[PDB]
């Protein structure tokens, strides 16, 4: 409802230090998580309350710049958290971390708005039903399978193929998707958000005319404070929520880096009056990543098939950032930097790319076996490649892999801007015959890299011609 007590819901700013504004109310202390309105402004400045310091003083986290703020400025108490307008009337538009319209097309007329802080779905709300969903990608679809409501997680070590992949999943999946879609861009480039906008126009997805728009774009990025990157992920989630629940539909949600939800704390923690931790971080990262990701799920009212992305600071999976996250993603894909040298793209690795949907019941007995067999050969392969033989192969022991490694290196669509290679895909269709051959030995002999930047076995001989070797 948003209505304070019969006593002043106005406080006066008593302290400003970058992203932290301390405020002091006399007749009506505003709860933690409440959205506050800074008066005397030339724009909209909301400070999210964070602590109740005592001496009748709160502690807020700035949602935008704290420039020019002055020790005494009036701050208003809305009486409810940051609430953004939720509804179909937000589709095709671009919102920011507060619900303000940033695609410039004027007011977002909506029936209601929902708080960005909502109780996560309870135990007796969850759903065990794991119905499959195909992407037609090598490692990504086959190896570590995906699923309805299942969370995807792309672990990239900074420029290894995390965001390229997502645009791609948009390609095969988003467009052809029935039901609505969302894209919360948290942290990452504004450049991309722009293009992504116009590309979504070029391909109708976002149509500025009719009302045939299916995606909703929530943004809050890099040129902004951490209080903002802290919650843009929430907002673009509060969106997808409303669609699944109050409008019973199976939504999709695209978070471009969801751990920016944590760079955030890593930028506000200590400056909040907290004692550091792992790497400096925060004694909250666990509950943080937790409380948030436990919303982007399915339920007895609807499903949210989501796709996230998680960055690898200093290339260290040993960071409690990519790490802690793992326990949430219903399929792993740790793209390796030592893999991009090899060109292998996507850089998904034949080890750290798990799934809680890879059993013979849903993926295949045939499929999940050669998968075991592909990583098997691959494991002793990782050793042999250096161990025993010492780099140079040949040696002895003829007792395929280099082949399969080229198989799952599908260069696909979103990578056209590099070498004309296009949409290498197709939904399982002819994986059969093909990949199995490699492993048992069949058809396996074609002069090494002669089968490199392509996938289907049919192009072993449809290239042997391209590069021939005989007389």
């Amino acid at each position: 409802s948003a209505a304070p007590k019969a006593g002043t819901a106005t406080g006066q700013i008593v302290a400003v230090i970058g992203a932290v504004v301390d405020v002091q109310f006399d007749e009506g202390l505003p709860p933690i998580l409440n959205a506050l309105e800074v008066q005397g402004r030339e724009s909209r400045l909301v400070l999210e309350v964070a602590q109740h310091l005592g001496e009748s003083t709160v502690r807020t986290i700035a949602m935008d710049g704290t420039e020019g703020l002055v020790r005494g400025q009036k701050v208003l108490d809305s009486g409810a958290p940051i609430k953004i307008p939720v509804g179909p009337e937000t589709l095709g538009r671009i919102m920011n971390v507060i619900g303000e319209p940033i695609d410039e097309r004027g007011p977002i007329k909506t029936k209601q708005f929902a708080p960005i802080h909502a109780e996560a779905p309870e135990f007796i709300e969850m759903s065990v039903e794991q119905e499959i969903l195909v992407t037609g990608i090598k490692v990504v679809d086959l190896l570590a399978p995906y699923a309805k409501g299942g969370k995807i997680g792309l672990f990239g070590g900074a420029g290894v193929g995390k965001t390229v992949l997502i645009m791609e999943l948009i390609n095969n999946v988003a467009k052809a998707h029935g039901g609505y879609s969302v894209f919360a861009g948290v942290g990452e480039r504004t450049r991309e958000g722009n293009d992504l906008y116009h590309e979504m126009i070029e391909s109708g997805v976002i149509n500025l005319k009719d009302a045939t728009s299916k995606v909703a774009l929530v943004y809050g990025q890099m040129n902004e404070p951490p209080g903002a990157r802290a919650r843009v992920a929430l907002t673009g989630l509060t969106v997808a929520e409303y669609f699944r629940d109050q409008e019973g539909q199976d939504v999709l949600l695209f978070i471009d880096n969801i751990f920016r939800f944590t760079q955030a704390g890593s930028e506000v923690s200590a400056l909040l009056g907290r004692i550091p931790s792992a790497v400096g971080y925060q004694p909250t990262l666990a509950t943080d990543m937790g409380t948030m990701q436990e919303r982007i799920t399915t339920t007895k009212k609807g499903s949210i098939t989501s796709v996230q992305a998680i960055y690898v600071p200093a290339d260290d999976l040993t960071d409690p950032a990519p790490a802690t996250t793992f326990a949430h993603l219903d399929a792993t894909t740790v793209l390796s930097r030592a893999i991009a040298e090899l060109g292998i793209y996507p850089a998904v690795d034949p080890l750290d790319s798990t799934s809680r949907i890879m059993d013979p019941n849903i993926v295949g007995s045939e499929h999940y076996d050669v998968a075991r067999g592909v990583q098997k050969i691959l494991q002793d392969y990782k050793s042999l490649q250096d161990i025993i033989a010492i780099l140079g192969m040949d040696e002895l022991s003829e007792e395929r892999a280099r082949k399969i490694q080229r198989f799952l290196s599908q260069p696909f669509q979103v990578a056209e801007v590099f070498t004309g290679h296009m949409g290498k895909l197709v939904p399982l269709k002819e994986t059969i015959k093909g990949f199995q051959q490699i492993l048992a030995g069949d058809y396996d002999h074609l002069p090494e890299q002669a089968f490199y930047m392509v996938g289907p076995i049919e192009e072993a001989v449809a290239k042997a011609d391209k590069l021939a070797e005989e007389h």
Binding site: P276, G280, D319, D380, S383, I388, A389, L391, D394, E395
Partner: protein, 124 residues
């Protein structure tokens, strides 16, 4: 910095060894095409360690060519092994020393980080 150094040598060993690995089979190709008619009934009726067992046992285009022709392959097999049994068992170390960097990559990051706060957080 440090492991980068002992990770260099490995990578430096790769190029030479791992490429020759392909040659390991190539030498075979450049042999059989002519050797075969002379074998079986066509007549009658590092560097591994293969080129050694024969020589230590000391305690006219006929035999001298027929033997060498078959000995040719027994000799280059060293490459075979040098690039496959020397590299099968020498890589792990790539996946091992790379896997502790990030151990002491993380470490230092979470070692000096302690000191920075060891003083910072406690004052007045």
């Amino acid at each position: 910095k440090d492991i980068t150094r002992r990770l260099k040598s490995i990578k430096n060993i790769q190029k030479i060894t791992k490429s020759m690995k392909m040659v390991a089979a190539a030498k075979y190709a450049r042999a059989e095409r002519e050797l075969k008619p002379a074998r079986v009934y066509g007549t009658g009726s590092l560097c591994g360690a293969i080129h050694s067992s024969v020589a230590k046992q000391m305690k006219l285009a006929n035999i001298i060519y027929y033997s060498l022709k078959e000995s040719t392959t027994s000799e280059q097999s060293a490459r075979m092994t040098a690039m496959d049994n020397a590299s099968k068992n020498a890589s792990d170390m790539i996946d091992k020393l790379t896997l502790t960097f990030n151990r002491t990559r993380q470490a230092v990051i979470t070692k000096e980080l302690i000191e920075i706060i060891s003083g910072a957080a406690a004052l007045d």
